[PDB]
Design a protein around this nucleic acid. Sequence first.
RNA 1: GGACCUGGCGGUGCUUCAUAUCCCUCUAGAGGAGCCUGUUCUGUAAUCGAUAAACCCCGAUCAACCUCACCACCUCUUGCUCAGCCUAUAUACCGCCAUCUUCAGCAAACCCUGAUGAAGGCUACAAAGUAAGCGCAAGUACCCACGUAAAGACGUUAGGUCAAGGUGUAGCCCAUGAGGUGGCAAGAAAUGGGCUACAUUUUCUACCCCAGAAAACUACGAUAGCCCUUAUGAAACUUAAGGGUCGAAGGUGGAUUUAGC
Lengths: 132, 101, 49, 171, 88, 316, 196, 565
Amino acid sequence: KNRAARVRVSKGDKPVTYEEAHAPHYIAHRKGWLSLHTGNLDGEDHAAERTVEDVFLRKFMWGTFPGCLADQLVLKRRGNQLEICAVVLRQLSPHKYYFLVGYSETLLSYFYKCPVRLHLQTVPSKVVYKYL
Amino acid sequence: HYVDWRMWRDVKRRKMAYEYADERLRINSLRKNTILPKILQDVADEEIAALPRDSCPVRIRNRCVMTSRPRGVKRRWRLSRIVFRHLADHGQLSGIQRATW
Amino acid sequence: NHHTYAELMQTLRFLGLYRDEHQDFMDEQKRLKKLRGKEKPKKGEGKRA
Amino acid sequence: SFFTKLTADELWKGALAETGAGAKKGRGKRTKKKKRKDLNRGQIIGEGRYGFLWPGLNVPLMKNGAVQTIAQRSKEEQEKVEADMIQQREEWDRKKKMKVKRERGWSGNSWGGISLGPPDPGPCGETYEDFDTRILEVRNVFTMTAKEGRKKSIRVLVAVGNGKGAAGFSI
Amino acid sequence: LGISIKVHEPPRKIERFTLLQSVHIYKKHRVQYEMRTLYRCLELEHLTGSTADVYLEYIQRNLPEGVAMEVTKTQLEQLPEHIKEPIW
Amino acid sequence: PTSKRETYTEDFIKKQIEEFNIGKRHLANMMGEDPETFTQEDIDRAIAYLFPSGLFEKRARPVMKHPEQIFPRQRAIQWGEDGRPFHYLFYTGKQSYYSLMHDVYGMLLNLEKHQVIGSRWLIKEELEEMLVEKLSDLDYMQFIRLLEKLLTSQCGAAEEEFVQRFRRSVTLESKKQLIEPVQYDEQGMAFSKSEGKRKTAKAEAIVYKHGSGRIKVNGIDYQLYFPITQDREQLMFPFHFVDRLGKHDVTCTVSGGGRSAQAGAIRLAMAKALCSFVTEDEVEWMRQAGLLTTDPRVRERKKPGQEGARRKFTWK
Amino acid sequence: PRRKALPPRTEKMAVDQDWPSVYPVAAPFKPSAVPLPVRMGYPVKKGVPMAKEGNLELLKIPNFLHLTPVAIKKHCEALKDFCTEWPAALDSDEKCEKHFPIEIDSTDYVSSGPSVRNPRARVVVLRVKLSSLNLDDHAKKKLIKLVGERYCKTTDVLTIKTDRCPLRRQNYDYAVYLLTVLYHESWNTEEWEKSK
Amino acid sequence: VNRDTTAVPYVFQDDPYLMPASSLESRSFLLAKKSGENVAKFIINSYPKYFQKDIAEPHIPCLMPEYFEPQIKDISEAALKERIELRKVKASVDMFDQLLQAGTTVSLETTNSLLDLLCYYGDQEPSTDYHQFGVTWRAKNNAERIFSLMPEKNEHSYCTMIRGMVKHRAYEQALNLYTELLNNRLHADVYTFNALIEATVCAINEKFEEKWSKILELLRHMVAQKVKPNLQTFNTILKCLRRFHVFARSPALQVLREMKAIGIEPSLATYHHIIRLFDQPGDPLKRSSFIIYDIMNELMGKRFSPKDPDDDKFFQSAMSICSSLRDLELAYQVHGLLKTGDNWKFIGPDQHRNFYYSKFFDLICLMEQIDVTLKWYEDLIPSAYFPHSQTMIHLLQALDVANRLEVIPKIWKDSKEYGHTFRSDLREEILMLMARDKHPPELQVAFADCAADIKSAYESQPIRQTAQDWPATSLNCIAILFLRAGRTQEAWKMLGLFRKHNKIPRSELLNELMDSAKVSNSPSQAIEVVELASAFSLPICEGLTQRVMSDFAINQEQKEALSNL
RNA sequence: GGACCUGGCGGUGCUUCAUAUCCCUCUAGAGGAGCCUGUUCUGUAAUCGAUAAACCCCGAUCAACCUCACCACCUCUUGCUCAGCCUAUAUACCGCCAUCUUCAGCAAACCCUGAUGAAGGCUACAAAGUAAGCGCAAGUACCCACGUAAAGACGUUAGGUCAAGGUGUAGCCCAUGAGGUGGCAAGAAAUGGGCUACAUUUUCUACCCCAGAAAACUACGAUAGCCCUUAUGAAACUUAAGGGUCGAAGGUGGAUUUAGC
Ligand SMILES: [K+]
Ligand SMILES: [K+]
Ligand SMILES: [K+]
Ligand SMILES: [K+]
Ligand SMILES: [K+]
Ligand SMILES: [K+]
Ligand SMILES: [K+]
Ligand SMILES: [K+]
Ligand SMILES: [Mg+2]
Ligand SMILES: [Mg+2]
Ligand SMILES: [Mg+2]
Ligand SMILES: [Mg+2]
Ligand SMILES: [Mg+2]
Ligand SMILES: [Mg+2]
Ligand SMILES: [Mg+2]
Ligand SMILES: [Mg+2]
Ligand SMILES: [Mg+2]
Ligand SMILES: [Mg+2]
Ligand SMILES: [Mg+2]
Ligand SMILES: [Mg+2]
Ligand SMILES: [Mg+2]
């Protein structure tokens, strides 16, 4: 049976998110896309280089904001700019958040030669869609 | 820090194919004609065959950039079917959705 | 260039700014095998000779 | 490489083998169960091997009313921090390797005679703090099923009493 | 801004491709993916260089993520001096 | 327990009514409209511009509706502080369903003492909204059996109103072909234009009111354009059925498809354009003959694991 | 002790404020800034759509909160000092082909990414009718034989497409050079043109 | 687009948890974000090879790693100029001797480019990412050693030496070095003359009359060497004259009347040094008032451009002089001159900015109508600046004067959002004002809702080093706000805290407690009131006790009450 | 050992069914010949894996070198990597799947029955069941309401894959690692799937549907063999295309069997 991106049923004590509660056949019906660029449009190029940046950015943020990411990243590209939008927990102190914003923005701007901006949206606790 | 030695060999192959690209092009041009004498074309057949084997572009293999898989690779994303689906099944590839018609 | 990606995030982990959960995993498994006796031998001075 | 690295959740899920064919029908011994450990429990954001002190993250941003600058611990001072950390972890392991001496019942491995505490309080302001629960028998009953085959089920017999003439049992 | 503009919608394109469902064997079981590209042509007329410059910058800057653009410009020129009469 | 059914009280819904009214005045300031005359259709239009979503499911897109159309109707508290249920049939479990059966059974006894198209019985799913009670299939049938029994009897005026509540309405679209508007050309000849479709073929046909039975497909005589007789037979069919051959002049232009797909597309176009020069009764006969219906049979796609659309690879 | 989050500024917002000042430029959906009870998501059985707080579906959307009608009308009023007036004389398109018989094509591509380069931006197409050129019988007959399939008899338009050089300013100069040599070579009668 | 009055500065994250509450967080949240950019550049220049790859088109030169380490590792004349552009003071001075020791000819343009780097920093290394009091001009410093070695010295040589001494408070020596310049038949530049006026006065603390004669000699030498003064030359004179507050008043104006004649548009700094000189802590401030009025009219309706570093300080100075004069018509001109063009960038750093708005919003509340004072409070705060306790207390004294005590339940919610949740002086002026007089029920029940939120603050406090302390007045007021409101039940639970902390209860709280008990008609409670007052030995209790006895007191209780005394 | 429970099975019964399905019935095929291709045997110094249904043009949307893991010979040793391993174990696993599924179940939490045994739980003119959640369903995609996709729970077969990658355990560390040069991957035989044919409803040509020829030892019929040329490539008897020569079997296929409304 199909397994991809599916959270198997449990007693009911497992909390899943909206994105985690929907399988691949809902990606364009009930879900959007976590990355939005033009590489995959008809007649566009550099789809393999925008993809490698996304795989690394999601890992850079997961290891740079450990335990603070409630949900997956939403990467946005507008021309030269790259916008990282994230939902984070409120456990960490704000002082440490501002440090990580200026460190990640600057480091990633010199690495991908592009203006990078990061927009945090803190949430008290991980939003729960339903309990599987 | 590449996936495996197989990937590392191709990296060298692709680096040596970029250095001799012009030299090989200029020598083949002589061979690929009916104008120049055979004597000169026979000397160019020995010059391009004496260059390192890794400069030949037919030895370059389009492997995956994450798992170095030689077959089942998509050229537009340079990914294997397994790595492509993983990112596509999680909605990480802009525009990629499952087809139903 | 896997070198750049693999060398940057190795340096950032030693500087404390990136937490690699995969290395921690295999840093702890390699630490629990020294206590169990399964330690990598010195080169040259191997089991065979 | 750096793109062939997974997360902690994926690494432990494969190492524990909790969900597998072996677990399903008594095909795996419990002599040496593998145990999950959190490798991020005692980690501070900004602490690395080089011993760098990052203002605003690792250490206080301002000292003596003035902003600090980037500094790096000395070898002598960084060697004391790694050894004092290892104490933290070394503790967890053996502590988590001690035993809670359950007042045994009729036998050491027997469930019978063990206390389960008082019953759960009722919703409409009902409590049974004066009652005591004691196990009498714990049997493992099996039944043949159409798809799974031999599935394991538990039958338990208990008694409750207040010590003042009121008592009952259930299954 | 006082520009004449007409809008129509060209037929969309759907690129599809198939991949093996399993890591190993099971050839008969595959998965199909698609990319949908939708178009929208805005044909403006009788502009000038300055007018097109600011307008294009304004809409180009506000172009949303996941949306490309192809601006085709048809410029009006005059016959070159040499083309006016032959060099007898 | 972590999973609890999201219960919404009257005080919570009362605070949601105030946030929508205030949000309705903010959305009108963004768009520059008058707050007072800002209906719900404009909110749906403003939320689709400010929050453009292309999700196929329309229930998964941004929505800013009134809290009475979002939150579901909930069974209200069914007892006072003392604890006595208001209704006398509370302990039945279906006090709303049984109070209705008790009322209907009480009106059928009075009748003994003193003694249609376009309408359908309320469906099960629509009857659980009037009562806010889950109902089985069998219970719904029992209720319908009493209403029908009520109708057969000589019910009074009041009873008719009672039954009418449970009778929903169905709009039936008259199966009548839409006549095309007869036009006039520069010379003054009357004609009617229509369009047809068959497989991948699309055709436009112009049917002149008076003619000598001349047909030109793409500027070519039909017999030249259609060598195969079958194709010509299809062209004749519409006119032969209405027994008016050699009376109209046709000028059509078919594009796409193949030999047999083009004729079918022209047949349907001529037939539709020939309904303007025939009586209503004749148009119904054409419809019953299958001359005004668009054949929906189109090629079926091939599946990844099979040789064909439905053919399977040989089983070893 | 544990830091406590402040109440959202939405409550402070007035109904008769200036929205453009809140969302002057493109930004992601901030539920603490948007004073709308907008929900999104597919509801569960006997459930309602997810609220904006913590909604990752409203962050994926490329919103147009920065491009409200009031703003556009306010933005373009300030951009009328950059635009120039189109000559009133040129009413229709037939009059534009009398004073400007040459039409130059050039395309710009806008894609996301760090690099703005595109090899498709070098192509230049030059269209010009032969009725606007000072040609005679011989010249016109000879010019149609040199261009081959670049001339369409149905429209009497010569189309020159140049993609040889990297830059678009070089291909425009090359297309104007080709038009001159073809015009000056069409008027020149050789001695081998008598064997026609 | 204008400013969003409901939001904090754009630099901060638009999120309630990440929004800076107080003014300390505001400055500490931007220093932690600047520490991430320094910790990233540290890593970008220490390990460039990771960031050398360039994929941008067009090339971004500002997103590439810097290379400070010198490359030319040889010993030539062109290898030294590469260590002077990288400001490597130690390497250049150590590599110069080796080059000089060899005997290779050194141009005069390359040794003058080394003195500039040594005379500027004073033979000290510049600050780096990672590796005030007194005089920093050491006597055993390279600047003086290399100066003697040089075989030939031009004008630039001395010019860049005199400026290096004054910068490191070596005033006395620069004047001795300026006599040699005169002995070599040379001519100094404007920059060299600028520092000579700073050194002259600073060198000795003599009376102004002597100094004025001295300064005039340099200016007369400046006109004898065909030297034209610039803005900074005049700016030093005004800055130097600051010490002689009174005496310099008239002379400073002369300097300003010579800047116009010779066409030198005074900048914001030139006016900032005049007002400071004129400004003094004097009650009349008669002279100061006229000066600012004339200055503002001249500056009125102008756009400014940076010329001197002191230009920023002007706005802070003007507002301070306006708050001392208590003139609001003059504060609307200064703040109206800060909005024209892009003059809003001269306001200054965060410290200067908060001081300017504080003095500003404090003169608005006091002086103007309370309806507009609440429009400036919604605009500036928090988008412009976070308020300090004294500003919320200054606002509370305006509502009291404007009989608008219904906004105090809104001023306290804001205070909690601006970091004044646990400010003793703030809570001690809010409770007294609310409890000062009786108010209608609807307004009396709102004050009780603020006293129940102000009472929680005392119960839970951030600092646990000391035992929780309740001011005498607060407890005195929180209890009387419950009675009037109607929360009698809670009014009796606060009685124990009065004696627990030995806090004396006022008579107005006891007198009003009688009505509550009388309405309840429960003598028991009434005795409790008498018991509490008796504990403090209050005189009124003895007289009050008799009245309670007459009205509603049990016979047994009456006997006990007298004995208790 | 006696008596029960559940489940499975039955060359077990009744009744009702199967719509491309069990059988008959409709249509084109398979097995027959040649070729292509895979597998198994055999062979070779010379991989691995899948392998009843659910393997067999399967991993491979692909092997001249490379790919490559194989063999033979030579070489290196902190080694592209704060090493490395295509080394063993899929019966430690994640991950991705197959299958029954062309199903309709699945289930927490309660309640009741059976004397409080495993177990069980319906009757509508109603007799103990109520049920969130998962699935089906509904929605959605494609040309609608149809149909086709997709979806398809829990489980089953310790099903498949450590050789996608990662990984637990045990093992190698001057070698079970790494690199270079050359090289094999065949065919007595058997078998699966497919292509082309055995022709006249055909063959060739013109046309694209009103034609003229052909037509059994110079007919139909090879995409095979042999020879040449060309294309790609550093490299081709070798791969592919084309031309020339050649003109075989085969004359409709045993037992059985596949797909399709
Ligand atoms: K049985
Ligand atoms: K056959
Ligand atoms: K065969
Ligand atoms: K598995
Ligand atoms: K393994
Ligand atoms: K593996
Ligand atoms: K076959
Ligand atoms: K044939
Ligand atoms: Mg060749
Ligand atoms: Mg024991
Ligand atoms: Mg399937
Ligand atoms: Mg077919
Ligand atoms: Mg094999
Ligand atoms: Mg080889
Ligand atoms: Mg090997
Ligand atoms: Mg298995
Ligand atoms: Mg359907
Ligand atoms: Mg299917
Ligand atoms: Mg479905
Ligand atoms: Mg023949
Ligand atoms: Mg042949």
